[PDB]
Amino acid sequence: MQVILLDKVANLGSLGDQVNVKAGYARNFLVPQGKAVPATKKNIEFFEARRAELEAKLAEVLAAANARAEKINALETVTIASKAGDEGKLFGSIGTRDIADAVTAAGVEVAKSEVRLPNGVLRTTGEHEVSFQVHSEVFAKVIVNVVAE
Template structure:
């Protein structure tokens, strides 16, 4: 099944690429997620009309991600306080939620 990609998809292509995928993958994943549309004549014309808008949207998302990455790299070290035993072993674990909360508290916004 031929589809037009509306977003970058790993191991498949990037925005605007027409690729051939299995029908089930297109119907069950790509189209419902909004990552692709079937490559009909109508959809090809519609996509070409909106190409600049979609590329600008993708560039904005990439710029925001790069800005967050620079802010996180500028932090350097983040300290997370947790209870530990006499030998320095932690009582429990430090998960992704704890790290995200510490980075947010240090001044980096999530979105």
């Protein structure tokens, strides 16, 4: 009794997994409760289409991820106007909010959430490397500077 899963019934697998299973299981329980559907030509193709459509969504998102990445990765250095550090010590902290606004004016929009200030909170003045977690895994890299106000 081949049947296509609609959820993660017990150990049978997850949504979209044709598996051989004893008739009774689906003939009177899985199907009348809607937890799965019989593995038939029409249904299987539609689910396989749904499978490939979510694959295309995964492709498209990760494709646009490298887009943002390159947009700002290659150089694209930005600097912000922070109260003159005066012989050093900056007069303030450069937070995720402020750094996001800077890159956003440059064009490459970034939300502070995504920003990840490595090994510090941008306390000094002058040049300081930065990074951005553009995607769920893809890592970027940008140089940011500071000058007078």
